[PDB]
Design a protein around this ligand. Sequence first.
Ligand SMILES: Oc1cc(O)c(-c2nnc3ccc(Br)cn23)cc1Cl
Length: 207
Amino acid sequence: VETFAFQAEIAQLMSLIINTFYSNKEIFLRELISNSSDALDKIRYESLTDPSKLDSGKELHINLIPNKQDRTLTIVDTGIGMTKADLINNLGTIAKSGTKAFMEALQAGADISMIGQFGVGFYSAYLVAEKVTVITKHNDDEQYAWESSAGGSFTVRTDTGEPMGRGTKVILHLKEDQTEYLEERRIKEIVKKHSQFIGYPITLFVE
Ligand SMILES: Oc1cc(O)c(-c2nnc3ccc(Br)cn23)cc1Cl
């Protein structure tokens, strides 16, 4: 298991997300679903010039899986997945500018719900999660597990769990007072409100 420090600006953003009083927490789901849709768009486009990229799975979709026993909500997609370089360096590097812009906008009247306009919506996960675990598999790379409970660091390890094929699974370990996001009717409500026109099947599992 390797431990890494977040870029300072991203640590700052995460602390803001964790510490700011902001009741409209449900927007985390729209942001994660949007990121999944983006990843699905990417593999779809790439498969047009190289159809073998779908040898790891032709189905392009999103599953939402709540688990009350584990207190987790998992957002699964069969998108392009992430390389080790994506996890450690790339996604944090590209998020730098967006983080700065977002934090500046907040000082000038914007609110946290606008976070996706700056390309850093993933971090809204920390509105509801005490810990986020991300399992990911990109073609031509190994399956990885990324994990962070904030506090300025994240880990990455090669994942010896059940093979995914291709895509990304974001596992939200929900805060004690955020268990509403495990309820069928609540998730349905949020998807209908914010994610109605996503261009991929979204299947909400029940318990
Ligand atoms: O399918 C996906 C779904 C996602 O939420 C993400 C994603 N977007 N931003 C980040 C930041 C860190 C990690 Br670890 C995953 N991210 C990336 C892919 Cl590839």
